[PDB]
């Protein structure tokens, strides 16, 4: 469901980001991940998924 | 728009709540107002309006 997809998506995006040089991680990518995590914590798993969409589009 | 409606709705619900004995304000009402304010601060003015709907239904 959205909750599992949100958690899986956060891990998937992080795993891809963690293969980047840290000094090269865009601020927009960090912010999108943080928004996703905030919304996950609020139980807005659907909004987490939309923030993950933004994070993926911010990947170099 | 949703932003103005959210701000107006927070004030409207508070004005009605502030006419209650404070020791008698339901916890569910306080929580709904706080959620609305959190979502307002996140710029989710639509989600604020849905939390305000819950607050109104929690009025004694
Ligand atoms: Ho939110």
């Amino acid at each position: 469901d959205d909750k599992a997809a949100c958690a899986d998506g956060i891990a998937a995006v992080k795993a891809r980001v963690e293969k980047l040089a840290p000094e090269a991680v865009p601020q927009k990518l960090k912010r999108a991940l943080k928004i996703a995590e905030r919304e996950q914590g609020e139980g807005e798993f659907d909004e987490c998924l939309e923030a993950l969409d933004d994070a993926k589009r911010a990947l170099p």
Side-chain angles (χ1 to χ4, degrees), chain A:
Chain A
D1 61 1
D2 282 353
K3 177 172 175 180
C6 166
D8 292 352
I10 292 174
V13 175
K14 284 178 73 132
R16 176 99 142 74
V17 173
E18 290 164 6
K19 303 313 189 349
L20 290 180
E23 68 275 28
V25 175
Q27 182 102 301
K28 190 180 185 311
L29 177 51
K30 308 185 166 278
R31 286 166 173 185
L33 259 183
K34 282 177 166 177
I35 293 292
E37 290 159 3
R38 179 189 72 197
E39 293 302 314
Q40 175 186 230
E42 296 176 353
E44 312 203 55
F45 304 111
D46 42 16
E47 309 236 21
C48 162
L49 291 162
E50 306 199 13
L52 288 171
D53 198 320
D54 293 339
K56 297 155 131 216
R57 303 174 3 250
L59 282 171

